Design a binder for this molecule. Structure first.
Ligand SMILES: CCCCCCCC/C=C\CCCCCCCC(=O)OC[C@H](COP(=O)(O)OCCN)OC(=O)CCCCCCC/C=C\CCCCCCCC
Ligand SMILES: CCCCCCCC/C=C\CCCCCCCC(=O)OC[C@H](COP(=O)(O)OCCN)OC(=O)CCCCCCC/C=C\CCCCCCCC
Ligand code: HEM
Ligand code: HEM
Ligand code: HEM
Ligand SMILES: CO/C=C(/C(=O)OC)c1ccccc1Oc1cc(Oc2ccccc2C#N)ncn1
Lengths: 271, 422, 59, 101, 442, 49, 55, 54
């Protein structure tokens, strides 16, 4: 469902930018250093590098004029997310939902209400429990203690690392030693999602009845846990090599293996 | 360089006749004439001949629906199917240098149809359209009902698929119809603008559905009924006929001539027809606009003869009566020896002019090579035409005033007479 | 005839019409600015720093 | 020898759609060619396909499968659509080719 | 081969009688023939007060001459099996006869008798007056012709070409024996006429029979002079005749054409062949090569559509006409204009290659019979001042290529203010401005 | 009937070059279009600035 | 206009064709629950976000 | 559908409200304020964000 998918990738990118600029607002140590590390990456773009960066900062370093514009952005983007979400669902309604067997469900459709209004409300409380259990019984489990210290430009924290949900990308970033290649590699780690619709070779829609693709799928998921883990570790042996392996297999699996195994499976169905 | 060529005409072992004439025209026109039509239809498969007519562009075993149309159009060619109640012609035209190309599709369409169910299913709603445009001419509606009132079978069958049958014809029926009629002994491969050896090498080493004469049409039983259609139209079309003469019949020429004597179509634009006894007769009868002509059809084992009359509702009475009195007056020796002379000329001219058309010529040639196997020279057909006494004509007329009449009328018949009031 | 030439060369094919607007803007700006600034300074002789600057400009 | 056949029959069982009572062709993603192909299917084949699918979706929402007895056997899987689908693709490639020339 | 057959076509013989009349013919080996006189007259030559005269004259041309009254005349033609027909357009009129070559001379005499001695019987005129008035009401229900009339009415608004051939209700209710007499005496004259014949006829025997019945000689230099007509100004504009009670809408759109003499007309015709025509009874349906045809089919865009290139001496009309249901006018128009833009910007050698073959077959098909061959001669002379053989047409048509179609089309279509005529339930078709915009950028 | 219908007179609005019914209006067309398009192209430049 | 106001109204009609009478596959699993959670997630972030922004 | 201005799920919206949208032929200048209000709004939001950043 190409458009529903592409608007979805846009939702993801906007969500990341939002969380990124939101993270700076408390102005703790990781707030400032994360902002500093990441935004400096772009001064590596050729010719227009330093310019774009200094423009974004509103000066020569992450400072007050950066904070005020990040607050403005953080307040704004969520509304763009809400807007684009409407588009997401609009494109979606053009086709309706896909289903787990990947075959036409026109022969068996049911009204959203009460079936899914109830299923979704139930799904809401099932998730909401672990959420609140965390926010109430372990408030700081996921946060960096470094952020309980006011930002200090003259004291680099020993381990500048992101929030769990960015770790996997941080790992890929550091996998390519070379400021420019790493930035591209970083960008690509998410932009890769725009290519998925073009790498589908299977004659079937889902992986429900595709055992080879299913294991490749769980390899990928495991691959991402590894990158997440690598992203939280210092840049040293054995983490450095493991990092490059997982970063390399990440792109191989999506760009090469998935489309290849898909074709292979088409042959094994005598197609 | 090019000059006077001669109209060759072979006949293969299977009975497949091949006519041919090279007139060095920059364009060719090949055709496949066949003895088939709504005449061979049964109450069971009515309309199948009609649908077959529209099915000419459907995929065949050699070419696809797509390639047929694209392929022909590519060389600026054409492909069409004309047909009567008892003959079907599949012809194509194109510049001389493309004959071989256009030929493939022609050959494919007539001898290798596939009638794929889906293609056939999508095509049927088209009979509804095709038929609707045709019936815009009241002319066509009464003729349908005429053959229905004039016969109990074969020829009584409509030329346009009946309504109740649209969407019910099947690939099986199409196939059976073709297998049982499109047989080498019922087909002729005519072809103007081509060398005979060539058109012959094609017919043989290529045509395959063959042998026999398959299904044979039931005899044309005459009914003599009267079908009337009340539909409001300000103009009433009426046609009163009687069993006429068959084709290849000696009695044919007699009627054809009685046709022109009574009048068969105007020769002068917006002009009155004085040479038309029938026209002139009715003219003296009514005062308002109208039209009247001599109707004459010659079939394999029968024919119909009479008059056809368009007229304002309130005057259909006077107009049809007049058309009658003018036929009786003719059966009672009301025919000058001159009238017979004028007619014979109009007939010869009409015939001769009706062949200047590539289409008209091919039709002429092939019509014979199918219901004969020979080409009656123009001088011979001339000799046959004038060799018609003034008596023959008055006899033909008699046969009408005497024979059992069948009538077909449609419009605001509120003042139209019934066959038994004539 | 300029209008005809203009039409044929510039305004007929949409590609050239866009090229004319761009090239036209680049030239219009350069000229329009110089002109306006020209006007503004004349209407304000000896009032702008540009004007009095020389008096203290002398290292 | 019978290698390709050992593999296929293996993948076939590994895939598992036969546990829903679906034929291989029932599992095809309905792109443009497949849609045309389906329109050409005879009524009976079409209604059977429809039931098989409706049945599968019902099993799927129930999180069940058919009893081992009802599973489609590798060698009894009828390739009811492959014939039509091939012709549709053949026709399409002809046009594509021709519209290029 | 095709090439050769074209060369071996008997030449057209043209010779001029000192009185200004031209006699042309193509002798074939046919026992039947057609001879007639094509006149450079029509409604364009009429004026605001005699508009409809040439048509009124067309209704009398057959009701007898002075030498032989009505009954006598008809009876003489009928009795010989000859067919007498004719017509009258905006810039051309013709009266021709179909008979056996054997009567070629008796025919010629009848012709000359008609154009030169029309009786113009006072009692007849009052009768044809009522007849013409009915033919107007009949033709009024022919949307296709109502549309092309309106197209002219506006495309050439304020000029001679803006008038219909039949004339006005007033002109017809009042035209006089004089006006008709005058019209004839003013327009039917040797220098402006052509006696053409085709079939089995001897050019000689023809011209001899000609000199004999087309004697009338001129004295002054004026009589030998063919009058040049005042040029008609084209106007990009529209006329919308709306009647939602009509079942289908008709729409015709056109830009100004070059006029007979221009070689581009060859390319223009090739262009129209690429777009072609359609109608719900074409069996090719969705596989037709015409892109517009295919679209019309796929999307049920119209009941029919045609492209045309109507030429005139000094101008013309290059456009298209279509019939559609109220709710598909917009898409049809949209696609149609789209195809025109394709012509100017992206024609393919493949397309022209095919358009050319279709055109060849077309020209050849226009010479199928004696009447159609005779109609060609009458016209070729009257418009090109000579006969253009198929061999020549073919030569010209073969020189046309993609690159050339694009340039010519761009030159006549691209960014031009078109003339638009719409009749019927046309609410969905709208705005001249929008249509004008469909005139540029593929 | 439609034969009695004619286009009103637009002399009150016609541009000078197409005022005369006996003159080809094509000759002055690139002029009329060239002018109006010149205004437009200028509006664009003003706006692009 | 129409019988029930859930279809006629220019707004409810939207709420109906996307959250009530909207045709859904009968067999979609729990993995299809994340869209709505994402939507609710978003409403909640915006809400708590504004409340924090005010201080 | 023939033109992509009607088929597309988004352009279709832009078309049915700013291009092919049926408007009275005689509306005056008093009907120009809705669009100005819209433009006015886009401009306030724009200049507002630019100011909010400082
Ligand atoms: C990306 C950022 C990285 C962050 C870490 C990744 C999160 C890792 C958490 C592990 C996921 C827990 C889910 C385990 C559930 C196991 C399970 O039920 O699998 C079997 C089950 C069988 O399904 P059917 O074949 O249809 O059965 C029908 C016939 N009976 O499979 C499924 O449920 C389908 C899988 C969907 C869930 C996948 C979730 C993994 C999430 C990671 C993101 C991966 C994508 C790439 C993102 C790039 C940015
Ligand atoms: C130094 C600066 C140089 C660089 C600037 C680059 C900008 C160039 C832009 C590309 C050129 C534009 C191409 C246009 C082509 C499309 C077209 O058809 O013309 C536009 C077309 C005209 O139609 P036709 O007359 O029929 O033309 C037919 C041509 N045969 O539509 C128009 O009318 C558009 C032009 C009018 C602009 C109106 C804008 C009014 C706004 C004013 C307020 C001020 C602006 C402030 C901006 C706010 C930003 C936050
Ligand atoms: C703020 C984030 C997003 C919101 C609020 C959102 C919301 C929704 C909703 C409510 C649905 C319908 C219910 C469902 O199928 O789960 C949906 C479906 C879908 N979304 Fe999202 N989505 C978001 C992000 C994304 C992303 C990142 C992608 C992928 C890059 C995406 C891809 C899809 C697709 C392809 C569907 C179709 C589901 C199917 O197969 O039936 N969405 N989304
Ligand atoms: C897409 C929804 C949003 C996301 C993903 C998001 C994310 C974040 C994150 C990651 C933080 C830092 C949390 C921390 O302190 O460790 C943050 C802070 C903040 N957000 Fe949001 N936010 C969202 C929407 C909003 C909105 C709409 C507002 C209000 C207009 C807002 C206002 C704030 C404020 C005031 C802070 C700073 C105070 C604080 O650190 O708690 N947020 N947000
Ligand atoms: C409906 C649109 C808006 C209206 C009617 C509006 C109106 C105003 C008014 C009346 C003022 C005071 C002006 C003054 O200084 O005298 C103001 C100030 C301000 N507005 Fe807006 N505003 C709008 C939108 C926005 C938006 C969307 C933002 C940015 C998120 C914003 C940010 C500001 C800021 C930062 C100020 C304070 C600085 C200043 O006074 O110039 N405004 N606005
Ligand atoms: C301001 O720093 C915010 C951080 C954060 O994690 O916010 C949730 C952060 C903290 C420490 C170190 C880095 C940080 O930021 C980031 C940002 C980031 O952004 C991307 C994620 C995926 C793809 C591309 C990028 C980029 N650029 N990927 C990884 N870490």
């Amino acid at each position: 469902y190409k458009e529903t998918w592409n608007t979805g990738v846009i939702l993801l990118l906007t969500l990341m930018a939002t969380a990124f600029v939101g993270y700076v607002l408390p102005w703790g140590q990781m707030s400032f250093w994360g902002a500093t590390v990441i935004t400096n990456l772009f001064s590596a773009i050729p010719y227009i590098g330093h310019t774009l960066v200094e423009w974004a900062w509103g000066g020569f370093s992450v400072d007050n004029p950066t904070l005020t514009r990040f607050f403005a952005l953080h307040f704004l983007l969520p509304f763009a997310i809400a807007g684009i979400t409407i588009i997401h669902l609009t494109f979606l309604h053009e086709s309706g939902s896909n289903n787990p067997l990947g075959i036409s469900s026109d022969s068996d459709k049911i009204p959203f209400h009460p079936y899914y209004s109830f299923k979704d409300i139930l799904g809401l409380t099932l998730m909401l429990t672990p959420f609140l259990t965390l926010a109430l019984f372990s408030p700081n489990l996921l946060g960096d203690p470094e952020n309980f210290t006011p930002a200090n430009p003259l004291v680099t924290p020993p381990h500048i690392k992101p929030e769990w949900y960015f770790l996997f990308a941080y790992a890929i970033l550091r996998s390519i030693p070379n400021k420019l290649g790493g930035v591209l590699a970083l960008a690509a780690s998410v932009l890769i999602l725009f290519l998925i619709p073009f790498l589908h070779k299977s004659k079937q829609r889902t992986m429900t009845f595709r055992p080879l693709s299913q294991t490749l799928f769980w390899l990928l998921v495991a691959n991402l846990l590894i990158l997440t883990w690598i992203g939280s570790q210092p840049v040293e042996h054995p983490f450095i090599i493991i990092g490059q392996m997982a970063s390399l297999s990440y792109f191989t699996i999506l760009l090469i293996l998935f489309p290849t195994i898909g074709t292979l499976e088409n042959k094994m169905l005598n197609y | 360089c090019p000059g006077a060529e001669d109209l060759e005409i072979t006949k293969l072992p299977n009975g497949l006749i091949i006519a041919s004439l090279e007139n060095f025209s920059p364009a060719s026109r090949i055709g496949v004439f066949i003895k088939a039509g709504s005449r061979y239809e049964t109450t069971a498969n009515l309309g199948t001949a009609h649908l077959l007519r529209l099915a000419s562009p459907l995929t065949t075993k050699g070419a696809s629906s797509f390639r047929i149309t694209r392929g022909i159009e590519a060389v600026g060619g054409s492909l069409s199917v004309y047909s009567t109640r008892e003959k079907m012609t599949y012809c194509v035209e194109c510049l001389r240098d493309h004959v071989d190309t256009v030929m493939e599709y022609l050959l494919n369409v007539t001898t290798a149809p596939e009638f794929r169910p889906w293609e056939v299913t999508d095509l049927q709603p088209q009979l509804k359209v095709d038929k609707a445009v045709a019936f815009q001419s009241p002319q066509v509606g009464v003729l349908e009902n005429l053959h229905a009132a004039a016969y109990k079978t074969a020829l009584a069958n409509p030329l346009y698929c009946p309504d109740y049958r649209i969407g019910k014809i099947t690939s099986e029926q199409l196939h059976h119809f073709v297998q049982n009629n499109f047989t080498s002994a019922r087909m002729a491969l005519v072809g103007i603008g081509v060398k005979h050896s060539d058109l012959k090498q094609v017919a043989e080493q290529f045509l395959n559905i063959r042998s026999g004469a398959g299904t044979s049409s039931a005899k044309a039983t005459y009914w003599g009924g009267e079908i009337r259609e009340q539909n409001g139209h300000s103009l009433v079309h009426a046609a009163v006929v009687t069993e006429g003469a068959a084709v290849g019949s000696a009695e044919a020429n007699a009627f054809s001539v009685l046709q022109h004597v009574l009048g068969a179509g105007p020769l002068i634009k917006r002009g009155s027809s004085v040479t038309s006894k029938l026209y002139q007769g009715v003219a003296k009868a009514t005062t308002q606009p109208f039209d009247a002509s001599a109707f004459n059809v010659n079939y394999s084992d029968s024919g119909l003869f009479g008059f056809y009359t368009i007229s304002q509702a309130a005057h259909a009475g006077e107009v049809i009566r007049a058309a009658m009195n003018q036929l009786k007056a003719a059966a009672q020796g009301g025919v000058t020896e001159e009238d017979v002379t004028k007619a014979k000329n109009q007939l010869k001219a009409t015939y001769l002019m009706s062949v200047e058309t590539a289409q008209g010529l091919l039709n002429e040639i092939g019509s014979e090579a199918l219901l004969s196997g020979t080409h009656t020279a123009p001088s011979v057909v001339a000799q046959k035409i004038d060799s018609v006494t003034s008596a023959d004509v008055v006899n033909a007329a008699k046969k009408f005033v005497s024979g059992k009449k069948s009538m077909a009328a449609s419009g605001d018949l509120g003042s139209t007479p019934f066959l038994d009031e004539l | 005839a300029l209008l005809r030439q203009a039409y044929s060369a510039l305004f007929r094919r949409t590609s050239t019409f866009a090229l004319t607007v761009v090239l036209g803007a680049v030239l219009f700006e350069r000229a329009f600015d110089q002109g306006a600034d020209a006007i503004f300074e004349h209407l304000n002789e000896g009032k702008l720093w540009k004007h009095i600057k020389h008096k203290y400009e002398a290292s | 020898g019978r290698l390709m056949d050992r593999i296929r029959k293996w993948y076939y069982n590994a895939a598992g759609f036969n546990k829903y009572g679906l034929m291989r062709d029932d599992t095809l993603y309905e792109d443009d060619d497949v849609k045309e192909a389906l329109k050409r299917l005879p009524e009976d084949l079409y209604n059977e396909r429809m039931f098989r699918i409706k049945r599968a979706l019902d099993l799927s929402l129930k999180h069940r499968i058919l009893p081992k007895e009802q599973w489609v056997k590798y060698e009894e899987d009828k390739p009811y659509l492959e014939p039509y689908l091939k012709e549709v693709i053949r026709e399409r490639l002809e046009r594509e080719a021709w519209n290029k020339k | 081969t095709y090439a050769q057959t074209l060369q071996n076509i008997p030449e057209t013989n043209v010779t001029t009688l000192d009185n200004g009349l031209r006699v042309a013919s193509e002798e074939s080996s046919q026992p039947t023939c057609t001879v007639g006189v094509w006149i450079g007259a029509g409604s364009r030559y009429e004026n605001e007060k005699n508009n409809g005269a040439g048509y009124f004259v067309e209704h009398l041309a057959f009701k007898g001459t002075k030498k032989r009254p009505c009954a006598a005349f008809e009876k003489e033609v009928e009795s010989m099996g000859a067919h007498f027909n004719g017509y009258t357009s905006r810039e051309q009129t013709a009266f021709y006869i179909k008979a056996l070559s054997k009567d070629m001379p008796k025919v010629v005499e009848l012709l000359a008798d008609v154009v030169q001695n029309c009786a113009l019987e006072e009692s007849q005129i009052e009768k044809e007056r009522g007849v013409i008035l009915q033919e107007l009401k009949e033709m009024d229900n022919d949307m296709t012709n109502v549309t092309f009339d309106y197209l002219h009415a506006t495309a050439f608004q304020g000029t001679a070409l803006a008038r219909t051939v039949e004339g006005t209700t007033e002109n017809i209710k009042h035209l006089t024996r004089a006006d008709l007499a005058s019209y004839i005496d003013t327009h039917f004259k040797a220098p402006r006429m052509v006696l053409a014949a085709a079939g089995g006829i001897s050019h000689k025997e023809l011209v001899d029979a000609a000199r004999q019945h087309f004697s009338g000689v001129s004295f002054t230099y004026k009589e030998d002079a063919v009058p040049i007509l005042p040029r008609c100004r084209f106007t990009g504009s529209e006329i919308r005749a709306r009647d939602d009670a009509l079942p289908v809408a008709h729409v015709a759109l056109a830009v100004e054409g070059p006029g007979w003499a221009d070689p581009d007309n060859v390319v223009l015709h090739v262009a129209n062949a690429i777009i072609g025509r359609y109608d719900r009874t074409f069996g090719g349906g969705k596989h037709l090569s015409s892109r517009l045809a295919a679209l019309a089919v796929e999307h049920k865009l119209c009941h029919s559509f045609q492209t045309f290139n109507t030429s005139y001496s000094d101008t013309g009309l290059f456009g298209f006409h279509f019939v559609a249901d109220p709710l598909s006018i917009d898409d049809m128009m949209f696609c149609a204009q789209g195809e025109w833009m394709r012509l100017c910007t992206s024609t393919t050698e493949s397309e022209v290659k095919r358009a050319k073959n279709h055109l060849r077959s077309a020209m050849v098909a226009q010479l199928d019979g004696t009447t159609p061959v005779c109609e060609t001669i009458g016209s070729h002379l009257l418009n090109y001042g000579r006969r253009i053989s198929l061999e020549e047409w073919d030569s010209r048509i073969s020189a046309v290529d993609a690159r050339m179609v694009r340039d010519v089309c761009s030159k006549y279509i691209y960014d031009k203010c078109p003339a638009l005529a719409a009749v019927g339930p046309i609410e969905q078709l709208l705005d001249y401005n929008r249509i004008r915009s469909g005139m540029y950028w593929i | 009937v439609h034969n009695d219908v004619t286009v009103p007179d637009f002399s009150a609005y016609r541009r000078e070059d197409v005022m005369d019914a006996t003159t080809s209006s094509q000759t002055s067309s690139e002029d009329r279009k060239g002018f109006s398009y010149l205004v437009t192209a200028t509006a664009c430049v003003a706006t692009a600035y | 206009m129409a019988p029930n106001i859930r279809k006629s109204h220019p707004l409810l009609k939207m709420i109906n064709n996307s959250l009530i009478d909207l045709p859904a596959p009968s067999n979609i699993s729990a993995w299809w629950n994340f869209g709505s959670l994402l939507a609710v997630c978003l409403m909640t972030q915006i809400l708590t976000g504004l409340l924090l922004a005010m201080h």
